[PDB]
RNA sequence: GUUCGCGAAGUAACCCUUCGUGGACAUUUGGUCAAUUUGAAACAAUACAGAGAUGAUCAGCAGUUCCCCUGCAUAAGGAUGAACCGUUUUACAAAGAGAUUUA
């Protein structure tokens, strides 16, 4: 269960944010598998953005 | 048909009856509409499917329309009622550069 971040799913994210915008995360974890709302937005705001 | 009155005849004795005539009484309904095929109900059945916002499953209010339906309704429902989701070129110019033609 313990995961780490491929730049694959990371890129799919930044594309997703680049569409749906930040605060719709529950959709951004739909495209993205393996991952959750709080996980997505956690790494986003704390790192990727 | 009633009544008033006149005349005539008969009965009669100023009437009872019959005939004729004058007068009054009484005075214009209804239709926007013909009687089943060809001057207009709408459902149902067959087939085709089989519920907006989303990646997905639902609550919903609205907004516009030469669409309306149910409801006493200025209530509220009818898939949040349905239709919307499509097609998309000119107030048009200014500066610069090359090719062509001409005074
Ligand atoms: Mg309504
Ligand atoms: Mg619904
Ligand atoms: Mg409506």
UniProtKB/Swiss-Prot annotation:
Effect of residue 44 to G: No effect. Slower growth and thermosensitivity. Complete loss of function. Complete loss of function
Subcellular location: Cytoplasm; Nucleus
TM helices/strands, residue ranges: none
Superkingdom: Eukaryota
Coiled coil feature spans: none
DNA-binding region: 25-48
Protein family membership: Belongs to the CEF1 family.
Summary of subunit composition and partner proteins: Belongs to the NTC complex (or PRP19-associated complex), composed of at least CEF1, CLF1, ISY1, NTC20, SNT309, SYF1, SYF2, and PRP19.
Name listed for the protein in its UniProt record: Pre-mRNA-splicing factor CEF1
Organism of origin: Saccharomyces cerevisiae (strain ATCC 204508 / S288c)
Residues of the full protein shown: 9 to 57 of 590
